[PDB]
Amino acid sequence: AELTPILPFLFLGNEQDAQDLDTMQRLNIGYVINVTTHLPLYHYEKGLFNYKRLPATDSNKQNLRQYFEEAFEFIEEAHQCGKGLLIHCQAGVSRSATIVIAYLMKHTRMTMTDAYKFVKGKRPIISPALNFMGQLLEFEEDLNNGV
C-alpha cells in the first residue's frame, strides 16, 4: 500500500514509506512519528527531519492511549510551522492507524465510527488490533463526557 495522505499535513505510512526520502521531500514532510520501539529512525543521519519515537511493542495487550497526547502535541508542532508529518509503524495497519484515528476523534471531532471510516476509505488495509479498538472506544467515551 502506498503512503496515505490523511490531512494536508498528516500522512499515514509503513516502514517502507519512512525510507522513501524522495516522496517525503516532495510532500513537504518535516516531521516523523515512529510508533515502534524497535524500528530505526530512517534517514536520521541526514539531518532533515524532526523525529518522535512512541516506543510501542509487538504485543496487542499494550496501552497505546498513553502515547496519544504526546503524538497530538507533535502533530500540532508540525502543523504550526507549516510542515507535514509522516506517522508510521511497521505496516501502517494497526499501531500507527490507531493514533491517527485517535487524532481525528479529538482534533477533528469525528466520532470513532466516522474516524475509522475516514481512514479506512483512504487506507483499506488498516485493521487495528482488537485491544486497540477497545482503547479507542474508551477514548470516544472520554471525549463525549468532556474528560
Curated annotation (Swiss-Prot):
Tissue-level expression: Expressed in keratinocytes (at protein level). Detected in brain.
Localization of this protein: Cytoplasm; Nucleus
Residue stretches making up the Tyrosine-protein phosphatase domain: 2-145
Source taxon at top rank: Eukaryota
Signal peptide: none
Residue positions of the active site: C89 (phosphocysteine intermediate)
Subunit text: Monomer. Interacts with MAPK14.
Family: Belongs to the protein-tyrosine phosphatase family. Non-receptor class dual specificity subfamily.
Functional summary from the UniProt entry: Protein phosphatase involved in the inactivation of MAP kinases. Has a specificity for the MAPK11/MAPK12/MAPK13/MAPK14 subfamily. It preferably dephosphorylates p38.
Name of the protein in question: Dual specificity protein phosphatase 10
Originating species: Homo sapiens (Human)
Gene from which the chain derives: DUSP10
